[PDB]
């Protein structure tokens, strides 16, 4: 075929600031918290 030619945000689990979700093991990304 055609061949070519050549922000880290840290935190800690504290209520009510950052808490675990219900389906935290069933979801991924930034929606886990």
UniProtKB/Swiss-Prot annotation:
Per the entry, induction is: Down-regulated in the pyramidal cell layer of CA1 in the hippocampus by global ischemia.
Q: Which residues form a coiled coil?
A: none
The protein's location, in the record's own words, is: Cell membrane; Postsynaptic cell membrane; Postsynaptic density membrane
Q: In which tissues is it expressed?
A: Detected in forebrain. Detected in dendrites of neuronal cells. Expressed in the pyramidal cell layers of CA1 and CA3 and in the granule cell layer of the dentate gyrus.
Q: Please describe the post-translational modifications of this protein.
A: Palmitoylated. Depalmitoylated upon L-glutamate stimulation. Ubiquitinated by RNF167, leading to its degradation.
What's the superkingdom here?
A: Eukaryota
Function, please? Ionotropic glutamate receptor that functions as a ligand-gated cation channel, gated by L-glutamate and glutamatergic agonists such as alpha-amino-3-hydroxy-5-methyl-4-isoxazolepropionic acid (AMPA), quisqualic acid, and kainic acid. L-glutamate acts as an excitatory neurotransmitter at many synapses in the central nervous system and plays an important role in fast excitatory synaptic transmission.
Per the record, the domain comment is: The M4 transmembrane segment mediates tetramerization and is required for cell surface expression.
Which family does the similarity line name?
Belongs to the glutamate-gated ion channel (TC 1.A.10.1) family. GRIA2 subfamily.
**Other remarks on this protein:** The postsynaptic actions of L-glutamate are mediated by a variety of receptors that are named according to their selective agonists. This receptor binds AMPA (quisqualate) > L-glutamate > kainate.
Summary of subunit composition and partner proteins:
Homotetramer or heterotetramer of pore-forming glutamate receptor subunits. Tetramers may be formed by the dimerization of dimers. May interact with MPP4. Forms a ternary complex with GRIP1 and CSPG4. Interacts with ATAD1 in an ATP-dependent manner. ATAD1-catalyzed ATP hydrolysis disrupts binding to ATAD1 and to GRIP1 and leads to AMPAR complex disassembly. Interacts with GRIP2. Interacts with GRIP1. Interacts with NSF via its C-terminus. Interacts with CACNG2, PICK1 and GRIP2. Interacts with GRIA1 and SYNDIG1. Part of a complex containing GRIA2, NSF and NAPA and/or NAPB.
Query: What name is this protein filed under?
Result: Glutamate receptor 2
């Amino acid at each position: 075929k055609m061949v070519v030619t050549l922000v880290v945000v840290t935190t800690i689990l504290e209520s009510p600031y950052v808490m675990m979700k219900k389906n935290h093991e069933m979801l991924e990304g930034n929606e886990r918290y």
